[PDB]
C-alpha cells in the first residue's frame, strides 16, 4: 500500500525515497494577529501654548 | 612633448559558457534555496522500494520487476507471469528524488580622491575606471560559472591509463594524452545516457575539395590543447582534424570554432581554466608537456575538455529581470555628501558593484569531461 504515514514526527511517506520529503506540510493564513492601541484620557485635557 | 589626447584600451573578453545557461525565476520572501522533484521510472535500479510480491505470492526484497539489466537469464527469471485463477500476485513500487541549489553573494569596490579628479592632466579618467570595473565584474562572474560547471561534472574520463588526478602523468610507457578511442568512448557514453544531440550532419557541396563531416555534438577545449588535437591520427593512420574551410560551405560556422574531429565540433575558449600541479611529479625525462611548481616539485598540469548537454543545469535568477545575472552600481562623488563626520574635507569617493549568483543542476549525468595533459 502507498500509505501516507506522517512526514512530521519523523516517519517518511511511502512514495518518498531516501533523499526527499514532503514539500508542503502546513497551511499558513498570511493574516497576522495584532493588538490595538491603548486609550488616552489625560491627553485631551491639555491645551497647547506655542513657544 | 605633446600628449595625443587619445588613449589605448583593450576590449572585453568574450564569454562562451554564460550564454548557454538557462534562467529559473525565483521570487523573494522565500529564502536561499530552490528544490524540484524527480520521478524515477519503474524498471531502473534507483527504484528501491518495499512493495514487492513475486509470482508465487511471497514477499520479495525488490519492487521493480527487473533492474537496468540486459541479461536474458535474469529477465527470464524475473518476468511477470500470471496463472488463470490469478489474484494478489505481482506488485510494483515507485519513488521520487529531490534536488536543490542555493544563492551566494558577491561584490567589490574602489576609492579615489578629488584632487586626483581635478588636477589630473587626462580628462575622462573616471569613465575609464568605470569601464575596467565593469569588465572585471563580467569576467569574474563568467569564471565562477565555468569553475562550478567543471567541479559539478557527472561523466569523467581520464586519458591514458590514469585513475585519479594525481595519476595523470605525461612520463613513462603510457602518457596520459587524449586519443581517438577516448573520444569514441565519450560519444558512446553520451549516447547511452540518452543525451540529445546539438547539431546535424553536414553533407557535401558541389565545389571542388570539400569534405563531408557528420559530427553532432559540441565540445569546448582550451587554447593549449589545439596543437595536440591537430596532431591526432585516427585508427587507420590518416588525419583526424578537419579544418573549418572545408565545410564552411553547405553549413554554418559557429562562433570560435576551429574544426571537427570524429563526432565533436571543437570550439576554442580563450578563458578556459586548467588545474595546476594536479598531476604526478615530473622528472628530467619530460617529453615536452606543460608542468608547474607546487611545493618545490614539478607536477604535471591536468587540463579540461567539456561537453555540456541540454537541460543539464539552470541558473537561479534573484531579481535579475529574467537574466542570468544583473549588477548594481553606486557612486558617490566627493563633496559635502562625503564630508566625513571626523573629516569635513570631503576629498574622497567610491564606487561599488554587487550581485547574487547561484546554480541548480537538474541532471548531472549529461555533463561530460575529459582530463588530459597539454603539450607545451
Amino acid at each position: 500500500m502507498l500509505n501516507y504515514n506522517a512526514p512530521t514526527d519523523g516517519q517518511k511517506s511511502s512514495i518518498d525515497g531516501a533523499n526527499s520529503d514532503q514539500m508542503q506540510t502546513f497551511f499558513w493564513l498570511k493574516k497576522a494577529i495584532i493588538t490595538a492601541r491603548k486609550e488616552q484620557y489625560f491627553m485631551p485635557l491639555a491645551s497647547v501654548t506655542n513657544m | 612633448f605633446f600628449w595625443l589626447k587619445k588613449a589605448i584600451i583593450t576590449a572585453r573578453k568574450e564569454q562562451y559558457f554564460m550564454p548557454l545557461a538557462s534562467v529559473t525565476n525565483m521570487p523573494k520572501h522565500y529564502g536561499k534555496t530552490i528544490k524540484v522533484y524527480e520521478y524515477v521510472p519503474l524498471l531502473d535500479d534507483r527504484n528501491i522500494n518495499d512493495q514487492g510480491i513475486d509470482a508465487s505470492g511471497a514477499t520479495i526484497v525488490n519492487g521493480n520487476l527487473y533492474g537496468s539489466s540486459k541479461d536474458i537469464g535474469n529477465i527470464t527469471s524475473k518476468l511477470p507471469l500470471l496463472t488463470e485463477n490469478g489474484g494478489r500476485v505481482n506488485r510494483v513500487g515507485f519513488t521520487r528524488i529531490a534536488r536543490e541549489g542555493s544563492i551566494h553573494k558577491f561584490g567589490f569596490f574602489y576609492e579615489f580622491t578629488q584632487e586626483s579628479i581635478d588636477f589630473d592632466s587626462d580628462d575622462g579618467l573616471m569613465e575609464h575606471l568605470s569601464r575596467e570595473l565593469m569588465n572585471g565584474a563580467t569576467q569574474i562572474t563568467e569564471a565562477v560559472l565555468q569553475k562550478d560547471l567543471l567541479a559539478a561534472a557527472g561523466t569523467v574520463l581520464y586519458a591514458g591509463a590514469a585513475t585519479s588526478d594525481a595519476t595523470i602523468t605525461g612520463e613513462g610507457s603510457t602518457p596520459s594524452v587524449v586519443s581517438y578511442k577516448n573520444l569514441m568512448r565519450l560519444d558512446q557514453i553520451l549516447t547511452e545516457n540518452r543525451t540529445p544531440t546539438q547539431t546535424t550532419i553536414i553533407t557535401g557541396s558541389r565545389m571542388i575539395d570539400t569534405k563531408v563531416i557528420g559530427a553532432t555534438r559540441v565540445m569546448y577545449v582550451g587554447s593549449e590543447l589545439v596543437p595536440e588535437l591537430k596532431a591526432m591520427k585516427d585508427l587507420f593512420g590518416n588525419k583526424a582534424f578537419i579544418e573549418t574551410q572545408h565545410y564552411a560551405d553547405a553549413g554554418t560556422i559557429m562562433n570560435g570554432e576551429v574544426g571537427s574531429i570524429d563526432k565533436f565540433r571543437i570550439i576554442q575558449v580563450p578563458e578556459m581554466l586548467h588545474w595546476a600541479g594536479a598531476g604526478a611529479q615530473a622528472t628530467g625525462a619530460n617529453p615536452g608537456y606543460r608542468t608547474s611548481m607546487v611545493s618545490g616539485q614539478e607536477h604535471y598540469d591536468v587540463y579540461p575538455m567539456l561537453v555540456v548537454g541540454d537541460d543539464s543545469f539552470t541558473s537561479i535568477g534573484f531579481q535579475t529581470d529574467g537574466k542570468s545575472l544583473k549588477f548594481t552600481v553606486m557612486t558617490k562623488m566627493p563633496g559635502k555628501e562625503t564630508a566625513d563626520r571626523n573629516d569635513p574635507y570631503g576629498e574622497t569617493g567610491f564606487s561599488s558593484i554587487k550581485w547574487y549568483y547561484g546554480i541548480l543542476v537538474k541532471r548531472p549525468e549529461r555533463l561530460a569531461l575529459i582530463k588530459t595533459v597539454a603539450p607545451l
Partner: protein
C-alpha cells in the same frame, strides 16, 4: 495640535486618496481608478468619475 470640537460628527481626521491607473480586469489594458483609505480601512473604490 490638541484642538477638538465637542460634537463627534465634527471631528477632523486625515485621509488619503489614490489617483492612478490600474488593470481592473487583468487583460492588459490600464484604466483609471480612485481609491480612498483611512487608517487601515478602505472605504471607497471605483473608476475615475470625471469625464
Amino acid at each position: 495640535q490638541e484642538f477638538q470640537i465637542s460634537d463627534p460628527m465634527r471631528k477632523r481626521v486625515v485621509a488619503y486618496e489614490y489617483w492612478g491607473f490600474w488593470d481592473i480586469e487583468g487583460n492588459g489594458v490600464l484604466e483609471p481608478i480612485v481609491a480612498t483609505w483611512i487608517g487601515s480601512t478602505l472605504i471607497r473604490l471605483e473608476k475615475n468619475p470625471y469625464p
